[PDB]
């Protein structure tokens, strides 16, 4: 799948954190970066495709450490039934479309931390083999110990999908997301858990995410967290994940969940600063610093948060108040940080419901969510370069892919983006994409997605042959 | 549109109620009945297709006075969202499939008293023109003064679809069912109602059904009925319907509603015997007998009603108790009765939820509903011949189509069915279809529907190209 | 129960609409007004109690044409169960306390248009006989054709009390409000309705209120009104009310309901300008003018309405937008208008839930609601004198009590209030009460209610003997 | 506090499990047992009150290891609001009434494992001091880590009290049950949990019950259990409980919860056999046998469980199926068992809702619950003597009160009951009480409760002075 190209004469930001290098040239052959250096210092035979990066900035291909290519954030409110019913038969194409939408924003690698295993496998495999366009996918499959989209984990007091849908359909959806690893694992002794997780890991996942704490925030609010498992069952899960040799992700929503994750040396802790609206103790930050563990955080911009607060939004507490303070203090301490957003490609019927306030700097809008993330983190005092490293090298490191991707270095995959303006002068300039390259192949990124499916709109009631 | 055929040597039950005529032959040319006579009295040039009816019974094509080809009854519980979301783009084909399923049951003409106008129009016109297969369709479009499937008229206290769906989708679905004739009509002065119903009737409906009473039984139960309109607004609606020259249907759920419908000389009174679990007064029945108005009734069988009562079903009061007694008394009195069922082709995911008891002699299962109706009515004392007429000639008379269909008479359309066993001996023998003929064309009815859509099952999550 | 007193030397506003008379004296003997005229012109032997009305204004005792002394507005949202459970055993005392709270605001006569018959009878009879303090009560008992507080008439989609209370208690409350005249009347033929309403009227009510339209606004919103009865059953009810010789009240929520009420010559039409957010036609206003019928209207102040609109309040449409326009146009046409508010004495636990915006110029706060009403109507262009007549003579006339009360005239009951400042200069000066007299007895109105019950607060968990 | 009496000539079942000792006499002085011996071996100076026990059986005062004197089980369905609103002001008297109803059933000591702290304190102290009648009370106060009756811990998907009640009342009720030890504890670091539980234990509780697992079965069913706290927070709680010198109780709803409780050497494990409908592993039972820890279990009888299954009751899985099998296996293994029921004195309006089947051998009906427990356990194979010990000596042992009560031994409190029939011959004969003695004082137990409060019925709407 690799091709050959040269990105010529731009200011290079290679993702290793150093001072940027002007008039630099990147040379990619057969997918891989072979030469990085000064323009005058190396030659481009004109049988070779070139991009003119003069006056422009060269960055590695962007990396999102947490997306849902079947839109999971939606399923936690309105729209789950209609979306899943509408696209049954085509989930892998929904996933490919979402990957393409991510690619349209410069993101060449996505890490999907919750999805239905079958279609995300199909889509990853098709994208890897050139059979389909889109960002490179690595996935967890399901979240261990969490129920599917029609269980309590996606209910609200006034929103209970199972009251208005067939049990059969609901069960069929819950099964394709749970894959046998749902809430019932909490009823089992450790020796019955071990084989189930061992078998699950043999199914081909790139990493494993465990629900250390509950996923009941839609039902109970933010200040009543639980643990999904006893700690010895949790340790069973963790040990089997280590046996399988894949990275360990955690889902936590309390201070004690966070500490518990830290003491398991999690490779990546998803929304680590979501802590039941209780402030993270200095001790916990000191552990993150001593152990050099990666925390993913999911912030809101000043504007989005203010809008949320202005309408008493139900998820105003997800990133607001004490969690905002957590983000600020984590930044100021210099802990290892990873970009992730829970973003997905939201159904247009649900988008059409939304006010302009809801849409402006919306954190879950796949394709723009990473721009917004970097903006929000910089609004909280993060250094623009660190913010770029967060969306580039850091997730590669956390997921153990930094030998293949995440920085522009010889031997690594030729994923690259070119920006018209300086992202270190203004982080919103990350939006100023003009070229996108994946494995040395330049992408017509403005013409993505190739075959609109979810994003096809408006919708015709009776399509005539 | 029409073809030529002859049905030979069967006992004729012609639909006019007379003594059955043995060793009879029916001859059809270009869609029209040209000869009815004794067998040995008419030659069949044997280049002409023949059906050997010896030892068999010949009936007119069956007629159902009330169906919903988009399954409305379903939308009054679980399944509306998934069903409408899954088949958006294809509603007319859902309707054609249901029409074919009706045809598979011996029904050559269906009267649809609530549906979405655009797709039922498309389907009717394509079936009429030969572009699609199915029973002949006549329709009301919407019910004047009723809300769409995501309004109060389909809610239950613990079933509120709008709480878990996008407003945009809900609104789009309510608009294609309401077509501007929803609950808001109840807020208008008469002079502003007039143009809306005038314009509605210009959209090509075959008849018009008015909500004399409410449709809130799902929300409030059976003992709290309302009137939808004032008397003078009702005067406006009725006047405009009569001026458009189409039959007037009514929806009534109370004794006063029924009386109000009788006083307007309604052409057909849908579930006339549903009257708030209050018994129909003798004077009302005597009004029905004197004005000779058609009542559609929707009974349950003994087994079904008993299952319903056993599991304390929400709609046990639809046809149970006082409504059963109403049915019995209407039968004994000999009022004019019409077969109708509110049946539709139910989504297989919803059917798969059902127990054997729910499914057995289920009244809303399109394709078997009319058999079950006749069984149920004969269980209550109806004369089998009367029941057969209720499902052939009587609907045609009520809808003013008896000049074209509903009996086997010279000049009428050549819609015919053949049974292997005597329906007058045992009404369940209506199920023993061996031949079905529509407008002279014999139908391969065991092979319907042609292109399973709703009824395609099981459903595949990811269909590979 | 009458006593003797003289109100000396104040500017008299007698309620007949004329220019106010300065230096006037009102002389009451044994409950009745015996002399009204110039101060110099008549003598007060000093064995006689006097109030010094110098520099002050003399008005008749205030009259509220619509209250609920068991707080009905509350039962339509949160708090019904706890209130009714807390005060079972003492409803007549709740009612007396509320009457006393009305008296504290200058209101000497209240008309209660929905309540539980037994306790409102007990309280009226006790207040009339001196056994208990409070405003004079006249009542309807229940609203004919409406369900009790635990039926659909007080439900909202997210508020269903019967899901969390005993059926037994709920039924017991529904019975004491319905008194057999609930929703089931809609299921009956006219000849079965007649005796039930005839019997109900023999139970001792002062007037009868009929639910011409539905009471489902909490469940369905404002733009889906129904009629409770067929018009001939409605006419049965109306005729029996005329037979009984008591005033006819109507509840309407649509233009057609309003017209229907008008064509029955209703003595008082409660919230007549509540019309499904459709504008009242000129023709309907012309009928009100030609027939000189009384309309009660329930407006909001500019401030309260703005607050409601600022928080998307669920009952923002009760008096806002088109209904505001209705009020304005009714005022500008000069139709006969009556003050009423649906106000009650709200449980303090429910008041404690409320923001300051909700409480400021709240229309349903018994004891201040009439001040607010007059303010709101004057904000809409009503003449202050007409606004005073609306809360004084007009309800007396509508309910046919103007021969006994509602104006200061010889022969009438000696109900009087004294104000410190001029209500014709600023209508909020209606708040400046300094004396209150009922049947010639001066009231220590600042010390009401005598025996706090509902208003007793805070509430002690364990009261020790 | 104590009195003097003698019980003469009965078959003694003393609570220590030995062979029953015929023609025995028990002698009590100033509340204390001083003599147990053969009849003809001890003289009764006949100025001393006597109970003729000839032909009768003498048992220790019965003991219930788990009740709720404010009826908690009720609050998990319908009735919480009405019950708490109706009796605010009088909670301690509700508690005393329930204690008296326990006493009416032969129960002289009750252990209340969830209640509101203030009123249960008041009631315990007044019963202890002679100021009120009833069983001796020992209490936990609240359940550490559980929400109050208007939190998620008492919700069902279609039962959300807070949707129809004032926030103020709900909050006030949640505060008096939680006492600051609610769900928010799960958000805290260990060092901030420590002072709260330290201070909680200083408020005078007799023991402390910890929510090891969740209390969301009403909301999520039985197969989705969680842990309330991390291991180290649980360490803090347990450490502080042990340091306060009171018994440690646990609430567990999973196998891992049960194992976690066993590993902490809990003094009593409440509904130990409720384990997510997953069978208890043999190794857990063997742990119980080796550590000899007390398990409270809450079974259903055959009839009751069968009624429950017949009507598909929400709590059929509380004691049915795998939990029944757990009970059976625990009985066969001979683990230490304690009688407890979660029973309370249920509001008569709620009882009046119930069918005969619901009421028959109902496990939560205080005053009969312990009889039903013993019946249910003997139905599962328990030895009647063992069952009797489960309801006398065993709770006293688990709560560390066996030095004072639970057997008839010299030095212990003179709590005694007399039966007319042999409970070892048929366990239902535990119902044949003829005498009840508390601390030497014979109780007029047929005359309890003294002052019906909750149980006063029917309820009068308007009580005239
Ligand atoms: Co060269
Ligand atoms: Co912007
Ligand atoms: Co059958
Ligand atoms: Co004199
Ligand atoms: Co003010
Ligand atoms: Co029994």
Coordinates of C-alpha atoms in Angstrom, one line a residue, chain A residues 22-323:
Chain A
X22 CA 13.1 25.8 8.3
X23 CA 13.5 24.9 4.6
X24 CA 13.3 21.2 5.2
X25 CA 12.5 18.4 2.9
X26 CA 10.9 15.0 3.7
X27 CA 11.4 12.2 1.3
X28 CA 9.1 9.1 1.4
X29 CA 9.7 6.0 -0.6
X30 CA 7.3 3.1 -0.8
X31 CA 5.4 4.2 2.3
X32 CA 8.4 4.9 4.5
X33 CA 10.3 8.1 5.3
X34 CA 13.8 7.7 4.0
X35 CA 15.3 11.2 4.1
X36 CA 14.7 14.2 6.3
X37 CA 16.8 17.2 6.0
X38 CA 17.7 20.5 4.4
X39 CA 16.3 21.2 1.0
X40 CA 19.5 22.3 -0.7
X41 CA 21.1 19.2 0.8
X42 CA 19.0 16.7 -1.2
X43 CA 17.7 16.0 -4.6
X44 CA 14.3 15.3 -6.1
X45 CA 14.6 13.7 -9.6
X46 CA 11.6 15.1 -11.4
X47 CA 10.0 11.7 -12.1
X48 CA 9.0 12.0 -8.4
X49 CA 5.7 13.6 -7.1
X50 CA 6.3 16.7 -5.0
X51 CA 4.3 19.0 -2.8
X52 CA 5.5 22.6 -2.5
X53 CA 5.7 23.3 1.2
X54 CA 7.4 26.7 0.7
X55 CA 6.0 29.1 3.2
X56 CA 4.2 26.3 4.9
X57 CA 4.5 23.9 7.9
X58 CA 5.2 20.2 7.8
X59 CA 3.8 18.0 10.6
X60 CA 3.3 14.3 11.1
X61 CA 0.0 12.8 10.3
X62 CA -2.4 13.6 13.1
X63 CA -3.3 10.9 15.6
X64 CA -6.5 10.7 17.7
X65 CA -6.2 8.6 20.8
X66 CA -9.9 8.0 21.3
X67 CA -12.8 7.9 18.8
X68 CA -15.9 5.9 18.2
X69 CA -16.5 5.2 14.6
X70 CA -19.9 4.0 15.4
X71 CA -21.0 7.2 17.1
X72 CA -21.1 6.2 20.8
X73 CA -21.8 9.7 22.2
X74 CA -25.0 9.8 20.4
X75 CA -26.2 6.5 21.8
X76 CA -26.1 8.0 25.2
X77 CA -28.9 10.3 24.4
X78 CA -31.4 10.5 21.6
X79 CA -31.0 8.8 18.2
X80 CA -29.5 5.3 19.0
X81 CA -32.5 3.3 17.7
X82 CA -33.0 5.1 14.5
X83 CA -29.2 5.2 13.7
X84 CA -28.6 1.5 14.4
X85 CA -31.8 0.4 12.7
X86 CA -31.2 2.6 9.7
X87 CA -27.7 1.3 9.1
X88 CA -28.0 -2.4 10.0
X89 CA -26.3 -4.3 7.1
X90 CA -23.8 -1.5 6.6
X91 CA -21.9 -0.9 9.9
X92 CA -18.4 -1.4 8.4
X93 CA -19.2 1.3 5.8
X94 CA -20.4 3.7 8.6
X95 CA -17.1 3.0 10.2
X96 CA -15.1 3.5 7.0
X97 CA -17.0 6.8 6.3
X98 CA -16.1 8.0 9.8
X99 CA -12.5 7.0 9.3
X100 CA -12.6 9.0 6.0
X101 CA -14.0 12.0 7.9
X102 CA -11.2 11.7 10.4
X103 CA -8.7 11.6 7.5
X104 CA -10.3 14.7 6.0
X105 CA -9.1 16.6 9.2
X106 CA -5.5 15.4 8.8
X107 CA -5.8 12.4 11.1
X108 CA -4.1 9.4 9.6
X109 CA -4.3 7.1 12.6
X110 CA -7.3 6.6 14.9
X111 CA -7.6 4.6 18.0
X112 CA -11.2 3.4 18.6
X113 CA -11.8 2.5 22.2
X114 CA -15.4 1.3 22.0
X115 CA -17.2 -0.2 19.0
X116 CA -18.8 -3.3 17.7
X117 CA -16.0 -5.9 17.1
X118 CA -17.2 -7.4 13.8
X119 CA -17.7 -4.3 11.8
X120 CA -14.7 -2.5 13.2
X121 CA -12.6 -5.5 12.3
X122 CA -14.0 -5.6 8.8
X123 CA -13.4 -1.9 8.3
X124 CA -9.8 -1.9 9.8
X125 CA -8.9 -4.9 7.6
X126 CA -10.4 -3.3 4.5
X127 CA -8.7 0.0 5.1
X128 CA -5.3 -1.6 5.8
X129 CA -5.5 -3.6 2.5
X130 CA -6.4 -0.7 0.3
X131 CA -9.9 -2.1 -0.3
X132 CA -11.3 1.1 1.4
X133 CA -10.2 4.6 2.1
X134 CA -9.7 6.1 5.5
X135 CA -7.5 6.7 8.5
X136 CA -5.6 3.7 9.8
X137 CA -7.7 2.0 12.6
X138 CA -6.6 0.4 15.8
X139 CA -9.4 -0.8 18.1
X140 CA -10.3 -2.2 21.5
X141 CA -13.5 -3.8 20.5
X142 CA -15.8 -3.4 23.5
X143 CA -15.3 -2.0 26.9
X144 CA -14.8 -4.9 29.3
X145 CA -17.5 -5.0 31.9
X146 CA -19.8 -2.4 30.3
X147 CA -23.3 -3.1 28.9
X148 CA -24.3 -2.4 25.3
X149 CA -26.2 0.7 24.1
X150 CA -29.6 -0.6 25.3
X151 CA -28.6 -1.3 28.9
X152 CA -28.4 0.9 32.0
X153 CA -25.1 2.2 30.8
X154 CA -26.8 4.4 28.2
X155 CA -30.1 5.0 30.0
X156 CA -31.3 8.3 31.5
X157 CA -34.2 8.6 33.9
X158 CA -36.4 10.1 31.1
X159 CA -34.7 8.1 28.2
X160 CA -35.2 4.4 28.1
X161 CA -35.0 3.0 24.6
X162 CA -36.0 -0.5 25.5
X163 CA -39.5 0.8 26.4
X164 CA -40.1 1.7 22.7
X165 CA -38.2 -0.9 20.8
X166 CA -38.4 -4.6 20.1
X167 CA -36.5 -6.7 22.7
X168 CA -35.1 -8.8 19.8
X169 CA -33.5 -5.8 18.1
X170 CA -32.2 -4.4 21.3
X171 CA -30.7 -7.7 22.3
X172 CA -29.1 -8.1 18.8
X173 CA -27.5 -4.7 19.2
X174 CA -26.4 -5.3 22.7
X175 CA -24.8 -8.6 21.6
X176 CA -22.8 -7.1 18.8
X177 CA -21.4 -4.5 21.1
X178 CA -20.9 -6.6 24.3
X179 CA -19.5 -9.7 22.6
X180 CA -20.1 -11.6 25.9
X181 CA -18.1 -9.1 27.9
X182 CA -21.0 -7.1 29.4
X183 CA -22.3 -6.5 32.9
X184 CA -22.7 -10.2 33.8
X185 CA -18.9 -10.5 34.2
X186 CA -19.5 -8.7 37.5
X187 CA -21.5 -11.7 38.7
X188 CA -18.7 -14.2 38.2
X189 CA -15.9 -15.6 40.4
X190 CA -12.3 -14.9 39.1
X191 CA -11.7 -18.3 37.7
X192 CA -14.7 -18.0 35.5
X193 CA -13.7 -14.5 34.4
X194 CA -10.2 -15.6 33.3
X195 CA -11.1 -17.8 30.4
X196 CA -13.6 -15.3 29.0
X197 CA -11.2 -12.5 28.9
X198 CA -8.4 -14.8 27.6
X199 CA -10.8 -15.9 24.8
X200 CA -11.9 -12.3 24.1
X201 CA -8.2 -11.2 23.6
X202 CA -7.6 -14.0 21.1
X203 CA -10.2 -12.4 18.8
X204 CA -7.7 -9.8 17.3
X205 CA -7.9 -6.6 19.3
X206 CA -5.1 -4.0 19.2
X207 CA -5.6 -3.1 22.8
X208 CA -8.0 -3.7 25.7
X209 CA -10.1 -1.2 27.6
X210 CA -11.4 -2.2 31.0
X211 CA -14.3 -0.4 32.8
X212 CA -12.6 0.1 36.1
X213 CA -15.5 2.2 37.2
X214 CA -19.1 2.3 36.1
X215 CA -20.7 3.9 33.1
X216 CA -23.9 5.1 34.8
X217 CA -23.4 8.9 34.6
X218 CA -26.4 9.3 32.3
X219 CA -28.5 7.7 34.9
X220 CA -27.1 8.8 38.3
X221 CA -25.1 11.9 37.6
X222 CA -21.4 12.4 38.2
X223 CA -21.2 12.1 42.0
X224 CA -22.1 8.5 42.6
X225 CA -19.3 6.4 41.0
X226 CA -18.8 2.6 41.5
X227 CA -16.3 0.0 40.8
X228 CA -17.3 -2.6 38.1
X229 CA -15.2 -5.3 39.6
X230 CA -13.6 -6.4 42.8
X231 CA -9.9 -5.7 42.7
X232 CA -8.8 -9.3 42.4
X233 CA -11.1 -9.8 39.3
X234 CA -9.8 -6.6 38.0
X235 CA -6.3 -8.0 38.5
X236 CA -7.3 -11.2 36.6
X237 CA -8.4 -9.0 33.7
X238 CA -5.2 -6.9 33.8
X239 CA -2.9 -10.0 34.1
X240 CA -4.6 -11.6 31.1
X241 CA -4.2 -8.3 29.1
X242 CA -0.5 -8.4 30.0
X243 CA -0.3 -12.1 28.9
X244 CA -1.8 -11.2 25.6
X245 CA 0.9 -8.5 25.1
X246 CA -1.4 -5.6 24.1
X247 CA -1.7 -2.2 25.7
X248 CA -4.0 -1.7 28.7
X249 CA -6.6 1.1 28.6
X250 CA -8.9 2.1 31.5
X251 CA -12.2 3.8 31.9
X252 CA -12.4 5.7 35.2
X253 CA -14.8 8.3 36.7
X254 CA -13.6 8.7 40.3
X255 CA -10.4 9.6 42.1
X256 CA -10.1 6.1 43.4
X257 CA -10.7 4.6 40.0
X258 CA -7.9 6.8 38.7
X259 CA -5.6 5.7 41.5
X260 CA -6.5 2.1 40.9
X261 CA -5.7 2.5 37.2
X262 CA -2.4 4.2 38.0
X263 CA -1.4 1.3 40.3
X264 CA -2.0 -1.1 37.4
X265 CA 0.4 0.9 35.2
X266 CA -2.2 1.6 32.6
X267 CA -0.8 2.4 29.2
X268 CA -3.5 4.9 28.7
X269 CA -6.1 6.3 31.1
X270 CA -9.2 7.6 29.3
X271 CA -10.7 10.8 30.6
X272 CA -8.4 10.6 33.6
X273 CA -9.6 14.1 34.8
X274 CA -13.2 12.9 35.0
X275 CA -13.3 12.3 38.8
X276 CA -16.8 12.7 40.2
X277 CA -16.3 16.4 40.5
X278 CA -13.7 15.9 43.2
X279 CA -10.3 17.4 42.8
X280 CA -7.3 15.2 42.0
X281 CA -4.9 15.0 45.0
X282 CA -1.3 16.2 44.6
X283 CA -0.2 12.6 45.5
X284 CA -2.0 11.2 42.4
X285 CA -0.3 13.8 40.1
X286 CA 3.0 12.8 41.8
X287 CA 2.4 9.2 40.9
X288 CA 1.6 10.1 37.3
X289 CA 4.9 12.0 37.2
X290 CA 7.0 9.3 38.9
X291 CA 5.6 6.5 36.8
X292 CA 5.4 8.5 33.6
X293 CA 2.0 7.2 32.7
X294 CA -0.2 8.6 29.9
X295 CA -3.5 10.4 30.7
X296 CA -6.0 11.1 28.0
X297 CA -8.2 14.0 29.0
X298 CA -11.3 15.4 27.2
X299 CA -11.7 19.2 27.8
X300 CA -14.2 21.8 26.6
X301 CA -13.4 25.2 25.2
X302 CA -14.2 28.3 27.2
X303 CA -17.1 29.0 24.7
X304 CA -18.6 25.5 24.6
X305 CA -18.4 25.2 28.3
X306 CA -20.0 28.6 28.8
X307 CA -22.8 27.6 26.4
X308 CA -23.3 24.3 28.2
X309 CA -23.5 26.2 31.5
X310 CA -25.9 28.8 30.0
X311 CA -28.5 26.0 29.1
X312 CA -27.9 23.8 32.1
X313 CA -26.6 21.1 29.8
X314 CA -26.7 17.6 31.3
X315 CA -23.0 16.9 30.5
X316 CA -21.9 20.3 31.7
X317 CA -20.1 18.5 34.5
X318 CA -18.2 16.2 32.1
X319 CA -15.5 18.8 31.6
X320 CA -16.6 21.8 33.6
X321 CA -15.9 23.0 37.1
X322 CA -13.6 20.7 39.1
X323 CA -12.7 18.7 35.9

